[PDB]
């Protein structure tokens, strides 16, 4: 029962950087070591087998090396579509086991989000619920603060956020914040405001609407 330790658990590097992640087996496994890449929403894909053999149909920038107990996976030049979680896998003896995984995100220039606020449709209100949705589109870094104001009153504990994985083309994130209410509570107020704080916005951006208008 081998223990596979990957280092680091996550990292961010700029395009063109040489990324190196390590996999340490708890005992000697010779070159019985494979490397996998799991892009967002996909199953892992085989990149390196036998610790250093490049799989057919894989770009040359990927490679592996090492034997015995220490193995290093390397991306010679990090590319925008190389964002994924990378796993090492031993086949020294059954059972076969994977590592914890190394999430590789990409450092790019700052980008302010495009903000949009969506009042709940009259169709949703007929069901009895009311979700006020605020959209933050194509920003970096991932960190963003969204504060909800209802008649200039800060809300807390009644909103949920959801962010996409980093885009494989422009390395940006998109985020969705929803103020989850009932029809009864939603129709007791008029002004519903979405305030956004982000590293790319010199001043915070508020997007609001009056209920109905």
């Amino acid at each position: 029962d081998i223990q596979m330790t990957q280092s680091p658990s996550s990292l961010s590097a700029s395009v063109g950087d040489r990324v190196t992640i390590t996999c340490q087996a708890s005992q000697d496994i010779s070159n019985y070591l494979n490397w996998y890449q799991q892009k967002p929403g996909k199953a892992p894909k085989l990149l390196i087998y036998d610790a250093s053999n490049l799989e057919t149909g894989v770009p040359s920038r990927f490679s592996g090396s090492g034997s015995g107990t220490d193995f290093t996976f390397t991306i010679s030049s990090l590319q925008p579509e190389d964002i994924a979680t990378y796993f090492c896998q031993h086949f020294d003896h059954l059972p076969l086991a994977f590592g914890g995984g190394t999430k590789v995100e990409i450092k790019r220039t700052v980008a302010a989000p495009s903000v949009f606020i969506f009042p709940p449709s009259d169709e949703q209100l007929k069901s009895g619920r009311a979700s006020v949705v605020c959209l933050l589109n194509n920003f970096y870094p991932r960190e963003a603060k969204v504060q909800w104001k209802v008649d200039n009153a800060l809300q807390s504990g009644n909103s949920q956020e959801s962010v996409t994985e980093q885009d494989s083309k422009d390395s940006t994130y998109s985020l969705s914040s929803r103020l989850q209410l009932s029809k009864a509570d939603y129709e007791k107020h008029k002004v519903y405001a979405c305030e956004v704080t982000h590293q790319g916005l010199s001043s915070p951006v508020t997007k609001s609407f009056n209920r109905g208008e």
Binding site: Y49, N137, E161, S162, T164, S174, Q180
Partner: protein, 211 residues
Amino acid sequence: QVQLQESGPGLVKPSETLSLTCTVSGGSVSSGDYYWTWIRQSPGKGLEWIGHIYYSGNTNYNPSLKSRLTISIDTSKTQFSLKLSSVTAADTAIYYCVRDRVTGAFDIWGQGTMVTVSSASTKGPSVFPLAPTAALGCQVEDYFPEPVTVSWNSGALTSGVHTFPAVLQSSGLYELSSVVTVPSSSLGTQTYICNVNHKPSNTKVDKKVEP
């Protein structure tokens, strides 16, 4: 080029048996070069090798799942199956069927299938429009379990589309949005339909979004 694909229930009750089937299409399962394998992935135990079966009828299984595991093969239908007995919530995971070279390499995976262990029954999603470059979308909520697939105009519209990870509601059901940005001039001419598919309940909803 061989393709693998899993089929079976996305929702199974506790103490019930989880039955999954892999359909190997394009190639023969009666090949000596490969081991027909199952692998699952969940937040509590990461990627986990479950076991495999050889085309000669021999299996192996992971000792952690030695008790409740049964992997069969069907050369007549080019299928191999998985059975997990008396499941618990700890068995909730994405399950993959995988081709493993005898030399040792998972070189072909299935897309994976989400399995939730729950006493609750399935429920189809409610879909509501997010009306108006300009941003529009669809509000998909009140469904269980994961997942749901959202496409726009039957796949013709894919650029700028963002389908967000679902969050939980107070009801315990899921909720997400799928948005797409379009030029503001297209709002008078182009129609935008979001295609919501929820397999665990066999629910398909097409919703028109208009200004």
